[PDB]
Design a protein around this ligand. Structure first.
Ligand SMILES: CCCCCCCC/C=C\CCCCCCCC(=O)OC[C@H](COP(=O)(O)OCCN)OC(=O)CCCCCCC/C=C/CCCCCCCC
Lengths: 77, 722
């Protein structure tokens, strides 16, 4: 499937948000209701799904759906 | 996918239910009850090759006073010093006991002889005792008959004013221990079911789901007990009240866990929106092999007790192994069969949202930082060994039985007037090729009697040289009775009756045996009887062998279970490191269970653990503990594919609440076993209960997932995973 669709799938499954509900601009902790640990779950789930490493310092920069999409697009090459 | 076996159970769910119900009726009606088969199929309590056992046989054979290692003591008690009236009652009582050749092989009547009457009369003067040699070894059905035959004779005899008679001895205690164990089977089961019913009612909040779940356990319990009863009734196996008590609780505990696993996964599937038919197969694919693997483990683990030397352990293997195989076969066929038919009416659907955020968040921490979690749990698991230095086992069967059983009533009658050692004498016999009745050898008897009396921890020694047990002619009539009592009619062997100070059951008493044997050899060295052979018998000698035997056969039971459980887990999972981790983690946690149990019993309650406790409880802890790891690990193998780490988190949520409920049910089921009259079996019950609480709360939840997160793909070697 599309990389963006897969990322949205993972995010929605973890945070209990539907595929159409999660938006590119939405922020995990501010809008989707994430917290300090659901973001860790998100990071690990993306790492496993797309066989990529999000460094701890880089982990902080994923605050919205988009940020994850840009990161993975720039590293899924 | 629809596995073949699942389809067959699905297609024949109805007759499978009737097939097991009909089997339950057959074993209930046409087979005697297990608690009644055990009584007619009980096993002797000492291995045939123990030096104490064969020595006791030789002493009986050489002196022609029986062939069994079973003896019972009749204590006569009175409110005033025993006068002539007691003697008439005693004299008639002994004659009646002698007439019963079937049960009373010999009556060592000493109180009737003035030359030795003071040797058995209490210093108080208000009590006396006589030692009976009973037919059949301790604990065998014949011994229980002989004890009852002696006991009835005492009861039927009319006693003078104020006099009372009690029957005691190791054989009487073993007979009463068996009766107490069987007498308490109903109470254990009623409490177990009542507690489990209330617990499951909270977990599911639906009475029908609990009622059907417990009914299925009843069929597993009735079929497991029924099949084991058939074997025992046919003479194929030996049984003991420990096997019956332990088998009954394992079937209820393990049988209920399979029901919780089956319903737990079925309900989880329904939450995912799966149809009743698809949910049933999802349950089978997820738990059919886990139940079988967790079943062969308990059957295999308990079967490893058959390698032990002690009959208490050796006879405990097969009945528990066959019991668990029968219970599992029912759970794998009646379980899914009942689940399907119940589903036709919509009975097993979940009543509450099956939340998983709780365990996913726990799993996230464990998997993100696994090494710190592994270190913390290992330390908590290992800190239980701090109780090892102070751990003191016990061998006094008296203290682990009700105060009111007839054997204990008679023992208490002895303590009121005698020292605690008089009911547990020690006999040492020297056998040679010469007629020792010559005066020259009698000097050696005097020398050895004093030498043995010199050993610390002894109070009294009786022999020809010491008729009264303390220091003070072949033709005197009175001496003749002593001669034939302390010397073999052939004159080739002589025996000394030795009494310790303090209970010989204590480790101090056990230490006396080695000292006594060394002293006997030292006394005879450089004497005409230097080549004689030394035989030792009695409770101190019996438990000198048991103490040594009980150690090695704890090692054999533990090591064999690890080897067998690892093989089963290696076959079930197909992964080497996963198999080692499943059982290796539980092996470490044994320290926590040992520490918790010792702390509760020895220290808090001030009751030492019986020598049976560790060997029996260790077998179950390794078995059941690994099953919870197997359920968790078997879920890893399914969820993997979404990630080696994310698979652990997903599996933790799915199996989290399921195992915790199943863990507590097993722990409480084994904990409810403390309601038994046999405190020995209660110590086993809470020893397993405490351990399974630790395993379900720390081993499965924080230790196993952390190891899986640490090792990565190597956790599944040689399976190809990414
Ligand atoms: C009493 C009368 C009973 C009448 C009924 C007969 C019994 C019917 C009950 C159950 C059998 C059918 C259901 C059981 C599950 C079938 C097998 C299964 O599901 O998986 C097999 C599964 C396949 O692996 P996976 O692919 O991971 O599985 C996924 C699919 N589930 O393999 C296993 O489970 C391996 C089984 C063997 C394990 C190793 C055994 C080694 C030896 C053990 C000794 C055990 C103790 C012996 C004690 C002897 C005492 C005298």
């Amino acid at each position: 499937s599309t990389i963006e669709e897969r990322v949205k799938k993972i995010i929605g499954e973890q945070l209990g948000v539907k595929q159409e509900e999660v938006t590119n601009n939405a922020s995990f902790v501010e809008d989707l209701g994430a917290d300090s640990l659901d973001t860790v779950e998100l990071v690990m789930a993306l790492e496993e799904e797309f066989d990529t490493e999000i460094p701890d310092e880089e982990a902080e920069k994923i605050t919205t759906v988009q940020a994850a999409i840009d990161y993975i697009n720039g590293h899924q090459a | 996918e629809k596995p073949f076996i699942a389809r067959m159970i699905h297609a024949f769910a109805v007759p499978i239910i009737l097939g097991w119900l009909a089997v339950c009726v057959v074993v209930t009606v046409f087979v005697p009850s297990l608690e009644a088969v055990g009584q007619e199929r009980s096993v002797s309590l000492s291995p045939k090759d123990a030096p104490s056992f064969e020595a006791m046989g030789r002493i009986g054979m050489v002196f022609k006073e029986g062939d069994s290692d079973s003896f019972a003591m009749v204590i006569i008690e009175g409110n005033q010093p025993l006068g002539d009236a007691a003697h008439k009652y005693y004299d008639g009582l002994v004659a009646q006991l002698r007439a019963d050749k079937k049960h009373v092989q010999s009556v060592q009547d000493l109180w009737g002889d003035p030359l030795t009457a003071a040797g058995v009369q209490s210093n108080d003067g208000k009590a006396a005792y006589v030692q009976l040699s009973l037919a059949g070894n301790q604990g065998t059905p014949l011994a229980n008959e002989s004890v009852e035959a002696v006991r009835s004779i005492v009861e039927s005899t009319p006693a003078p004013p104020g006099i009372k008679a009690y029957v005691t001895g190791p054989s009487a205690l073993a007979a009463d221990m068996h009766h107490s164990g069987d007498r308490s089977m109903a109470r254990i089961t009623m409490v177990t079911v009542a507690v489990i019913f209330i617990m499951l009612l909270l977990v599911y909040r639906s009475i029908i789901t609990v009622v059907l779940l417990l009914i299925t356990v009843g069929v597993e319990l009735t079929a497991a007990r029924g099949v084991v009863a058939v074997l025992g009734h046919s003479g194929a196996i030996g049984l003991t009240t420990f096997a019956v008590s332990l088998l009954t609780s394992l079937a209820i505990a393990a049988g209920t866990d399979y029901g919780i696993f089956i319903i737990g996964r079925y309900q989880e599937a329904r939450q995912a929106g799966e149809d009743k038919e698809a949910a049933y197969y999802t349950m089978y694919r997820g738990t059919a092999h886990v139940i079988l693997g967790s079943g062969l483990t308990i059957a295999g683990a308990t079967f490893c007790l058959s390698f032990a030397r002690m009959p208490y352990f050796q006879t405990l293997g097969i009945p528990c192994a066959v019991g668990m195989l029968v219970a599992v076969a029912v759970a794998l066929t009646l379980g899914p069969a009942v689940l399907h038919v119940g589903s036709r009416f919509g009975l097993f659907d979940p009543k509450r949202l099956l939340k998983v955020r709780g365990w996913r968040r726990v799993g996230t921490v464990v998997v993100r930082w696994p090494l710190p979690v592994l270190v913390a749990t290992c330390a908590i698991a290992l800190v239980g060994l701090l109780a090892l230095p102070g751990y003191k086992t016990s061998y006094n069967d008296r203290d682990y039985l009700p105060d009111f059983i007839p054997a204990n009533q008679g023992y208490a009658a002895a303590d009121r007037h005698f020292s605690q050692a008089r009911m547990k004498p020690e006999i040492l016999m020297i056998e040679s090729d010469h007629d020792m009745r010559n005066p020259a050898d009698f000097l050696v008897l005097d020398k050895l009697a004093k030498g043995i009396f010199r050993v610390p921890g002894i109070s009294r020694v009786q022999a020809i040289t010491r008729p009264e047990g303390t220091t003070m002619v072949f033709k005197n009539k009175d001496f003749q009775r002593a001669m034939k009592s302390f010397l073999s009619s052939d004159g080739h062997a002589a025996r000394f009756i030795i009494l310790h100070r303090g209970d010989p059951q204590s480790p101090e008493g056990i230490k006396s045996i080695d000292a006594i044997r060394t002293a006997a050899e030292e006394s005879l060295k450089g004497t005409p009887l230097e080549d004689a052979k030394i035989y030792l018998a009695g409770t101190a000698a019996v438990f000198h062998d048991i103490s040594e035997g009980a150690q090695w056969d704890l090692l054999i039971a533990a090591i064999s279970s690890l080897c067998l459980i690892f093989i089963i887990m290696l076959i079930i999972t197909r992964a080497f490191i996963a198999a080692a981790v499943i059982v290796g983690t539980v092996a470490l946690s044994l320290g926590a269970s040992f520490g918790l149990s010792v702390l509760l019993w020895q220290h808090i309650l001030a009751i030492h653990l019986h020598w049976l406790v560790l060997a029996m409880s260790v077998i179950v802890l390794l078995a059941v503990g690994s099953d919870y790891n197997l359920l968790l690990v078997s879920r890893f193998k399914q969820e993997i594919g979404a990630g080696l780490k994310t698979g652990i988190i997903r599996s933790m949520g799915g199996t989290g609440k399921v195992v915790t409920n199943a863990g507590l049910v097993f722990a409480v089921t084994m904990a409810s076993m403390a309601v038994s009259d046999l405190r020995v079996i209660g110590q086993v019950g809470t020893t397993i209960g405490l351990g399974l609480l630790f395993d379900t709360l720390i081993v499965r939840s924080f230790m196993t997932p952390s190891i899986a997160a640490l090792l990565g793909r190597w956790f599944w070697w040689p399976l190809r995973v990414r």
